[PDB]
Design a protein around this ligand. Structure first.
Ligand SMILES: [Mg+2]
Ligand SMILES: [Zn+2]
Ligand SMILES: [Zn+2]
Lengths: 170, 144, 52, 57, 332, 1086, 111, 93
């Protein structure tokens, strides 16, 4: 079981691009908590690490500056979203975190077929590649938009799914 | 797979069936370390043969052997992979009675470890690369 | 926006001699339409004492 | 082949056998601690029996 | 119009021509616009939207009279018991097919933008069978054993099923549920063993320099045909797409270099060359023919399908394989 | 709020007490109220009668009594107690030599009583024992899979109450008998039973040449004694064939009722099938020193009959519900009780040998703990006894009717293929063919059908109406499956004038297969189309328009349907909803006609015609086993008239005495910007405004203290290193003050040991409002703690979780949905009158699943929205399309009538939608916009305007109230994110935390995923730095904190550790390079 | 630096004692009054290494200024505490005992 | 997707070589604090804050754009690791 991770009920996020996905502010916070402490060290929010975690200690401790720092650190970073059970290589895919209201993972509608994920109560684990090496290969070969074709068949596993085909066909 | 509408590339299946067609039995031990009935990989018996036949020794009459996926995965040189399946006592035992040069050549072989798996990044061909700029390479060129 | 009932510690409590629980009471209170005559006024605390 | 019989039994590191205090002072030790414990309980009782020179049986 | 297949090959050809990033932005554009137009479209399922063809009624007349005559053929006894039940099965299979065909025909003829029809036709959601069960008569349902019930659920989902019809429905329904849920735990049953045998195979060499190649036959002698027939369209692709040639291949007056990675276009012109009969087999590098002790060279494997370029040397092709083969195990 | 009744078919009898399958059964087992003189030989009494008298000193049985429960159900749930009754038994002991008679009543511990609602309370946990499916006792013949033309006999007793005896006929023709995996000529055992060759040859001789195959001259040359000896040699080789011990083996194997107990129902099966009778529940008996058979001869007789093909004989379907018993709660209870009593008998056998032979009483002998331990084991740690689905009253109601194939004395998971899982033809009216739990373990947990009930025999019986000629009769015969296959039973769908059938042709069901018959050919009739399914499935409207799979999921989701603060009874229901609440005993009713003197939220006191004053304490927000709050809200005004069997106060998930698992909301079925994608559900913030879908959930937290030598633990407010502001919501006792609002991190209960703090704070996942706290100190009045526990303090923290983004919504028709984006009232599709849609549903979720029940329910939700009336649409016996269109016509006239009355013409946007629809061909072309909208509304569709665009949604969409309900699978319980997490002590992987969460299982499949990706750095980091590794995780946290993007795992911790582990077993595991240079992987240090 | 292969093989008593850094001559472990290890126990720092990073038992040397140094007072090397997951011990046997694997694993290697 | 990921995959013989190059370059960029960048001031990846535009904190993006410029040279055994590190650290603290 992994440390730097998360999970929640998944929700379709139409607004977010393929290289990104919607993370709950709670989830986005806890996932990148140390990252948040670092960027808050960079900005004028918290003195040091201890005071930074103490600034993230309770629920009302949250503030505009803090969420802004989060938005700053997840900018250019990605999270490895994964659906249960993992059946193939695209069973996990990287997405640039995008803060979203609520407490549920906002997943891209396209990768659903690739995740074999349906929004009927499905829960997806999420992870963060801490190392810039790990972070790199995440947003290079594990990025959803970088694995458009299925490694199994060569067929696009990121093709327009149900609702999209409906609209376009209409 | 076609029957169920599933179309996956023949490549992958070729990979697995290759990994099943890798071991061969021995008809005649010859001048080798092997003996009649011993199970080892095709490439290794070919290397052993080409080493013995270029030495002046009688090669191994290898009999092509096909074993199942789990039977191929059970009789592997990777005694880590094998001692991660069942009766690891036996695997480690039979592998320790003979000083076994277990190359870290497998992903399962190396996950137990923790090192960069010989895959993608962790591949030796790719892992060992360097990045530089002209402002650095000029200074490099100066002292060298 | 707020409700305090005497001898009621939380929303999920229920008041003796009262049919509706504090939950349903608050539910009914959400339907309360309060007109502020004065635009500058932004808060009013209405009281209510009833028995029998 | 003589190496199969070991006249010296290696002991695994302490941390890999964490005799540690869990909830409510409950020391939840690994089974290996008690295993080596019994092994010495027989070993020293064998060396001391060699010193004593206890009867064969 | 744009359906699942058209958009599929669209994203694919965009991916191999325009590139990854432009294809991703393409994907999000198709998403945003397709969505805004999905809510603009006002596609909606109504009971009246689930249009029942008059052809269904007609077909029930025809199926009934024919099955009655069949029972007369059982009274005469030219058939056996199994062949009576098979004249029932044969009847209801083609009955369900004719009813379905009637459903979609009646749709595209009278209701082209019918929600059910546009969903099924686009490949958005549904398939011929499900729309058939919805609109036309529900297909024949199975007995507890292997046999199928003589009486099908002829009542549509729009009219409503009879109680007993719902029971005999629940038979095959619970069977299907028992089949789809049994593989949930076995989802990694294959993939495990496969990994156990394919964990040690990756792309180590850019080219093992093996002269050896496999020759995938573009022609398979289909058992039912007993002739050198051109094999299935998808089979050639899955057996040739993204693959290096050990021998140069000259087809359609076009040169495929010795050591060239084949594309889907290349495979397509190879198939067109096969229809004209230019080559029966293709001399192509394969993992089977690689000399690497624990792995496959870049040439022997071929294209990396995930990014539609030559396989990145070092790729866990073996685990990619184990997962590619183990993933659809649930669907099997 | 008025109700419109649909369906012409009348339920000739009301549903049975839906809990009686458990209630009547367990009461049949107990017979507490029944005096010892009139207690039937069933259940507890049956076990006493089977076990006693112990024939060594003769310990006999006189009677037994069941005392009143030490505590009420409330206090039992309150203090981790079993709602049990003190079991007593008056026994008499008679010295066979002296003739003296001693008698005494022995306290045999306690026996878990069953509540009025059919459930139990074991260790304070509401637990229901699901009835078990198993191959009924008796005799069953089944075709030999290896030998076609022959049949295998099989005598099967009660589970664990004897071996399976199989009478198999070989190609030679000799009769064989298989017991304990041993085969031997039955001839022998027959001779053992004092049978002449003559008796066999005369009893069987008319059946064929096989009887000659029975004949064995060596067996018949020796008297029954020697044949018995020979048999004992055959079954126990090596064991000396001494006469008495051999007789003891045969007797114990067959003639002894204590060792071999064939079921009473199995006795009825043997009796009815073979056409004979049993003196007792034994295959044979021991009389006057010789064996006398009871079962073998008739079984072999029917066997040779079936082999020869004698008419009146049939082969047995082992999955026939007339051949497959339902071990109900009472039977299972008294079976583990029977085993317990057997161990009492053996224990006594060990007692009578020790001490004074003369000085003995029915006390000194009795050892009650094998019994108590048996019962307690069966109620606590059995698979048939599970946590009561208290999510909603219906969930419990079905968990009671839930029937499992698993459990002790039944089937395993591998002993059950499709053969057992597949619905048999006899489940009709007896078992819901739809209520099987989805996913794994499917087909095994078939729930009981609605009108179905279990007899004394354990066979499911369904009610039918015997008919006379063409005329049907009000007479209701309850039939087992075995009887049903002998008659013709017409459907309830057929048109009936009063009684009499008026149909020339009638759809009927005969012995499983559907046949069209004449009225005179009709014999019986389905009581109602509701009898076929469980209660859950029966609550689903328009089920005949729903797919069996999706209605399986709907019926199953009914179990996890969550009660809400404004839980509204469905706009479209089946009429079974009204029965549910009173049968679930969720809502309290009136016991007599009278006036309600006192009306209160806590209690409702009523004055009856008797003049008696009856107080009803309302269960207010009691924490369910599944989390949802069980509350009871009054519905009768203060001082008003009430009749007998009338509602006094609503139950959980109930409105006006109906079942309200959720709230019907104005649903518009359309895609919305992809927000409703793949079953996702868009929702108006208007629903959150009026607090629709607001689930009250109570989580149970607890702290238990133990005593250590450095210092024990105590529940106190005095908690070290913590501010008073942090203890703001804690009272003096350390308990969180009732009414406080706690958050993740806040303290609930104090506890200190060695002084450092080890108190449990509010878990990171759940937090909210406290409604009730329970303080259980050591040795409190009627409180039982675990050994070593100094005190148990249990806080019940509630909260009203609204419908946030992600929560699992679903209708009754299997539309599992997830809250997409709670769009405000503005940017949501809305009616031309201005009415904003409550819920946007993805239409895609309808075709593939083939469940039009949601569509129809929407179409009626419309009419019910504009006519202000809810509808009762019985399953199958529900309103078809035409009546719905008529309803939609009247409701249309209400809808457009206001606009027409005010002086409003048709909207240009409306006419535009009518243009797009005329192009679509939904509405008729050429007619006036009012008539166009008329026909359009008939289609259950309305002109809807996109609130964000304003432009009318081209192509009209279906709208209408749908009884969507919130499910137990809500988000806040599932959300689970974490930077780091306190690592387990047994393994340095992260598991849980006081302020943080618990680690995320990175399964081997995900490992393969990262492998395939070639993300070796990500994988290395994942398994080591992000988990198993400590020395690298410190570097991870520290470097990421300092902003260093390169956490360094130069050497794998798992590898060096592995190397050392391998070395520990004296196996050298040297690491070498290509040069074979020993590369120190420990980087020195070794 | 690049571990290309890993060789498993049988270990002679010499190699067995090679990785060992002290003979566990006591069945003793952590007591209640003191959380420190007992005399030459399974957790003794004189055999397996220091509980704390770069700090001996008694506490004469407490920093990285000393590394590889063995304290003359308690007999503990001043290295990283993490070595207590690595450093090995040994148990000298009066009578040499056969490894139960090679004995009971089928087929019996010794046999 | 990532900007110029196509050209990036084209520059390398292996997508994973792109991975290691971008990664190691990002490690250099963070160890040196972006002062060793080959990106011109105008080519610096920007980010929108409540204050205004700031430099992109993520080193991976920086490395990928730097690689898109082609001003970076990648290959096996370009320079001994010790001398490389010491030179890059000599130019930048
Ligand atoms: Mg799902
Ligand atoms: Zn190759
Ligand atoms: Zn010291």
């Amino acid at each position: 079981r992994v440390d730097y991770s998360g999970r929640s009920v998944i929700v379709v996020g139409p607004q977010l691009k393929l290289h990104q996905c919607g993370l709950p502010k709670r989830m986005a916070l806890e996932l990148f908590k140390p990252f948040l402490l670092k960027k808050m060290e960079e900005k004028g929010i918290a003195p040091n690490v201890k005071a930074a975690r103490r600034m993230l200690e309770r629920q009302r401790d949250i503030k505009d500056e803090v969420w802004d720092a989060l938005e700053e650190v997840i900018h250019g970073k990605v999270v490895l979203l994964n659906r249960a059970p993992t059946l193939h290589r695209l069973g996990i895919q990287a997405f640039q975190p995008v803060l979203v209201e609520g407490q549920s993972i906002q997943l891209h509608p396209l990768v659903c077929e690739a995740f074999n994920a349906d929004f009927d109560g499905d829960q997806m684990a999420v992870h963060v590649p801490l190392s810039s090496f790990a972070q790199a290969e995440a947003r290079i070969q594990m990025l959803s938009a970088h694995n458009l074709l299925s490694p199994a068949s060569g067929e696009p596993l990121a093709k327009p799914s149900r609702d999209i085909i409906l609209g376009l066909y209409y | 797979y076609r029957a169920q509408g599933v179309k996956l590339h023949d490549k992958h299946i070729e990979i697995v069936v290759r990994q099943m067609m890798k071991y061969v039995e021995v008809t005649d031990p010859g001048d080798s370390r092997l003996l009649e009935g011993q199970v080892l990989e095709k490439w290794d018996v070919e290397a052993l043969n080409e080493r013995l036949i270029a030495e002046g020794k009688t090669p191994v009459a290898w009999k092509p052997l096909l074993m199942g996926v789990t039977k191929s995965a059970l009789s592997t040189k990777s005694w880590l992979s094998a001692a991660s399946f069942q009766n690891t006592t036996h695997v480690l035992t039979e592998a320790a009675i003979a000083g076994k040069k277990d190359e870290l050549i497998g992903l399962k072989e190396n996950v137990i470890l923790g090192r960069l798996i010989p895959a993608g990044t962790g591949s030796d061909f790719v892992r060992f690369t360097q990045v530089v700029d002209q402002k650095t390479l000029k200074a490099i060129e100066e002292a060298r | 926006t707020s409700v305090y009932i005497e001898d009621v510690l939380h929303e999920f409590s229920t008041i003796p001699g009262v049919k509706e629980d504090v939950v349903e009471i608050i539910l009914n209170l959400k339907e309360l339409v309060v007109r502020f005559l004065n635009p500058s006024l932004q808060t009013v605390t209405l009281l209510l004492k009833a028995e029998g | 082949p003589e190496w199969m019989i070991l006249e010296a039994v290696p002991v695994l590191p302490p941390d890999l056998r964490p005799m540690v205090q869990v909830d409510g002072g409950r020391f939840a030790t690994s089974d290996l601690n008690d295993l080596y414990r019994r092994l010495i309980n027989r070993n020293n009782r064998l060396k001391k029996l060699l010193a004593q020179g206890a009867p064969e049986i | 119009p744009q359906e699942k297949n058209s958009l599929k090959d669209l994203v694919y050809q965009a991916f191999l021509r325009l590139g990854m990033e432009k294809t991703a932005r393409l994907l999000d554009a198709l998403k945003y616009y397709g969505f805004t137009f999905s809510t603009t479209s006002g596609i909606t399922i109504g009971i009246d939207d689930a249009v029942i063809p008059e052809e269904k009624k007609q077909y029930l007349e025809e199926a009934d009279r024919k099955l009655l005559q069949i029972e007369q053929a059982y009274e005469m006894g030219f058939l056996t018991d199994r062949e009576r039940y098979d004249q029932i099965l044969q009847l209801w299979t083609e009955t369900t097919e004719k009813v379905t065909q009637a459903v979609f025909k009646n749709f595209e003829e009278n209701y082209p933008f019918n929600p059910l029809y546009v969903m099924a036709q686009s490949g958005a959601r549904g398939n011929p069978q499900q729309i058939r069960q919805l609109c036309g008569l529900r297909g024949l349902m199975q007995k507890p054993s292997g046999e199928t019930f003589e009486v099908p659920v002829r009542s549509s989902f729009r009219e409503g099923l009879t109680v007993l019809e719902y029971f005999i429905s629940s038979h095959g329904a619970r069977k299907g549920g028992a089949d789809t849920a049994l593989r949930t735990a076995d989802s990694g049953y294959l993939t495990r063993k496969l990994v156990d045998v394919t964990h040690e195979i990756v792309v180590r060499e850019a080219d093992c320099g093996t002269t050896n190649y496999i020759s995938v036959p573009l022609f398979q002698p289909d058992e039912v045909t007993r002739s050198l027939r051109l094999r299935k369209r998808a089979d050639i692709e899955a057996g040739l797409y993204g693959r290096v040639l050990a021998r140069e291949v000259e087809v359609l007056g076009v040169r495929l270099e010795e050591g060239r990675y084949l594309s889907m276009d290349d495979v397509h012109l190879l198939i067109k060359a096969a229809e004209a009969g230019e080559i029966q087999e293709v001399p192509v590098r394969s993992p089977l023919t690689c000399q690497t002790r624990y792995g496959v060279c870049q040439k022997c494997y071929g294209y990396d399908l995930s990014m539609a370029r030559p396989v990145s040397i070092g790729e866990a092709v073996g685990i990619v394989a184990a997962q590619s083969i183990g993933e659809p195990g649930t669907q099997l | 709020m008025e109700i419109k009744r649909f369906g012409r078919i009348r339920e000739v009898i009301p549903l049975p007490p839906l809990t009686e399958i458990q209630v009547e059964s367990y009461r049949r087992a107990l017979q507490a109220d029944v005096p010892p003189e009139k207690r039937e030989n069933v259940g507890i009494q049956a076990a006493f009668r089977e076990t006693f008298p112990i024939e060594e000193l003769v310990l006999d049985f006189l009677e037994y009594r069941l005392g009143e429960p030490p505590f009420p159900q409330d206090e039992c749930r309150e203090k981790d107690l079993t709602y049990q009754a003190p079991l007593y038994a008056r026994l008499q002991l008679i010295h066979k030599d002296t003739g003296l008679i001693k008698e005494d009543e022995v306290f045999l511990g306690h026996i878990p009583l069953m509540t009025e609602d059919g459930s139990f309370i074991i260790n304070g946990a509401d637990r229901v024992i699901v009835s078990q499916i198993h191959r009924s006792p008796g005799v069953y013949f089944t075709p030999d899979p290896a030998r076609p033309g022959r049949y295998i006999a099989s005598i099967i007793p009660l589970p664990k109450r004897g071996p399976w005896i199989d009478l198999e006929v070989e190609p030679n023709g000799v009769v064989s008998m298989k017991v304990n995996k041993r085969k031997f000529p039955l001839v022998l055992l027959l001779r053992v039973l004092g049978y002449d060759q003559e008796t066999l040859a005369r009893e069987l001789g008319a059946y064929g040449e096989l009887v000659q195959g029975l004949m064995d001259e060596s067996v018949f040359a020796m008297r029954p004694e020697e044949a018995l000896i020979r048999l004992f040699t055959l079954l126990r080789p090596g064991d000396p064939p001494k006469r008495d011990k051999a007789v003891a083996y045969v007797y114990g194997l067959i003639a002894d009722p204590r060792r071999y107990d064939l079921g009473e129902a199995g006795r009825y099966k043997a009796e009815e099938k073979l056409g004979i009778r049993l003196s007792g529940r034994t295959l044979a008996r021991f009389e006057d020193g010789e064996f006398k058979d009871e079962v073998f001869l008739p079984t072999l007789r029917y066997l040779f009959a079936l082999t020869a093909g004698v008419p009146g004989h049939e082969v047995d379907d082992i999955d026939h519900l007339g051949n497959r018993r339902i071990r109900t709660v009472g039977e299972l209870m008294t079976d583990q009780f029977r085993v317990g009593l057997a161990r009492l008998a053996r224990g006594v056998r060990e007692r009578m040998l020790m001490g004074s032979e003369d000085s003995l009483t029915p006390a000194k002998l009795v050892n009650s703990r094998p019994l108590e331990a048996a019962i307690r084991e069966f109620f606590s740690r059995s698979q048939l006894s599970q946590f009561k689905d208290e999510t909603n009253p219906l969930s419990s109601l079905r968990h009671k009717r839930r029937i499992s194939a698993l459990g002790p004395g039944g089937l395993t998971r591998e002993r059950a293929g499709f053969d057992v899982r597949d619905v048999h033809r006899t489940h009709y009216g007896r078992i819901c063919p739809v209520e099987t739990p989805e996913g794994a373990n499917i087909g095994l947990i078939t729930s009981l059908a609605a009108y179905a009930r279990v007899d004394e025999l354990g066979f499911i019986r369904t009610p039918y109406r015997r008919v006379v000629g063409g005329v049907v009769t009000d007479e209701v015969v309850y039939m087992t499956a075995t009887e049903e296959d002998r008659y013709t039973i017409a459907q309830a769908n057929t048109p009936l004038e009063g009684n009499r059938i008026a149909a020339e042709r009638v759809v009927a069901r005969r012995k499983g297969e559907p046949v069209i018959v004449s009225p005179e050919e009709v014999e019986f009739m389905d009581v109602s189309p509701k009898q076929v399914f469980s209660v859950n499935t029966n609550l689903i409207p328009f089920l005949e328009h729903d797919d069996a799979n999706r209605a399986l999921m709907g019926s199953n989701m009914q179990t996890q349907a969550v009660p809400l603060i404004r839980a509204q009874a469905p706009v479209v229901m089946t009429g079974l909803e009204e029965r549910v609440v009173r049968d679930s005993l969720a809502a309290l009713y009136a016991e007599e006609d009278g006036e309600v003197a006192k009306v209160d939220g806590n209690r409702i006191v009523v004055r009856y015609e008797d003049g008696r004053l009856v107080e009803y304490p309302l269960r207010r927000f009691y924490r369910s086993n599944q989390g949802t709050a069980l509350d009871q809200r009054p519905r009768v005004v203060v001082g008003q008239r009430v009749r007998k069997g009338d509602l006094l106060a609503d139950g959980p998930a109930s409105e006006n005495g109906f079942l309200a698992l959720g709230q019907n909301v104005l649903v518009a079925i359309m895609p919305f910007d992809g927000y409703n994608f793949e079953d996702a559900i868009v929702i108006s913030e208007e629903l959150l405004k009026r607090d629709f879908y607001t689930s009250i959930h109570i989580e149970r937290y607890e702290i238990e203290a133990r005593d250590t030598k450095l210092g024990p633990e105590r529940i106190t407010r005095d908690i070290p290193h913590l501010s008073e502001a942090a203890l703001r919501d804690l009272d003096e006792e350390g308990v969180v003050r009732i009414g406080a609002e706690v958050k993740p991190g806040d303290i609930l209960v104090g506890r200190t040991s060695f002084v450092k703090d080890t108190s449990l704070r509010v878990p990171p996942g759940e937090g909210g409002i406290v409604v009730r706290t329970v303080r259980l100190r050591r040795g409190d009045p009627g409180v039982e703690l675990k050994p070593g526990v100094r005190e148990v303090v249990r806080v019940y923290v509630a909260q009203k979780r609204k419908l946030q983004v992600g929560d699992k919504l679903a209708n009754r028709h299997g539309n599992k949905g997830v809250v997409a984006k709670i769009l405000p009232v503005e940017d949501m599709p809305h009616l031309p009158d201005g009415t904003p849609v409550d819920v946007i549903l993805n239409p895609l979720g309808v075709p593939s699943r083939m469940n039009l029940g949601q569509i129809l329910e929407t179409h009626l939700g419309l009419a019910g929205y504009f006519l202000g009336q809810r509808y009762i649409s019985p399953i199958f016996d529900g309103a078809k399309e035409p009546e719905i269109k008529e309803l939609l016509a009247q409701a249309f006239e209400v809808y457009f009538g206001k606009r027409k009355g005010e002086g409003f013409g048709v909207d240009k946007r409306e006419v535009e939608v009518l243009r797009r629809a005329e192009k679509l061909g939904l509405v008729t072309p050429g007619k006036t916009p009012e008539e166009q909208l008329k026909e359009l509304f008939l289609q259950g569709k309305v002109v809807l305007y996109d609130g964000r665009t304003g432009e009318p949604i081209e192509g009209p969409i279906v709208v209408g109230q749908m009884f969507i309900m919130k499910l137990y699978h809500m988000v806040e319980d599932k959300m689970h994110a974490r930077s780091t997490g306190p690592y387990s002590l047994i393994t340095q992987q992260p598991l849980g935390g006081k302020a943080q969460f618990g680690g995320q299982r990175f399964g081997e499949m995900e490992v393969w995923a990262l492998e395939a990706y070639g993300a070796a750095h990500t994988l290395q980091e994942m398994l080591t730095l992000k988990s198993d590794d400590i020395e690298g995780r410190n570097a991870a946290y520290e470097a990421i904190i300092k902003g260093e993007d390169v956490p360094e795992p130069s050497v794998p911790e798992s590898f060096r550790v592995l190397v050392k582990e391998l070395q520990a077993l004296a196996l050298d595991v040297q690491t070498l390079d290509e040069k074979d240079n020993p590369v120190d992987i420990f980087e020195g240090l070794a | 630096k690049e571990v290309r292969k890993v060789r498993i093989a049988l270990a002679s008593p010499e190699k067995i004692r090679s990785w060992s850094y002290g003979e566990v001559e006591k069945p003793e472990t952590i007591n209640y009054r003191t959380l420190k290890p007992e005399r030459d126990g399974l957790f003794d720092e004189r055999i397996f290494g220091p509980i704390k990073d770069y700090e001996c038992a008694c506490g004469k040397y407490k920093r990285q200024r000393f590394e590889g140094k063995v304290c003359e007072r308690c007999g503990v090397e001043v290295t990283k505490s993490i070595v207590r997951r690595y450093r090995m011990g040994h148990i000298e046997l009066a009578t040499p005992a056969a490894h139960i694997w090679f004995v009971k694993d089928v087929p019996s290697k010794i046999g | 997707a990532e900007p110029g990921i196509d050209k990036l995959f084209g520059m390398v013989d292996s997508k994973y070589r792109l991975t290691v190059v971008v990664a190691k370059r990002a490690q250099q960029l963070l160890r040196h604090g972006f002062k060793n960048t080959v990106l011109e001031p105008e080519e610096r990846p920007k980010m929108q804050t409540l204050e205004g535009l700031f430099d992109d904190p993520n080193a991976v993006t920086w490395a990928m754009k730097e690689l898109l410029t082609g001003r970076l040279v990648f290959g096996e055994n370009l320079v001994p690791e010790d001398r490389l590190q010491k030179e890059m650290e000599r130019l930048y603290p």
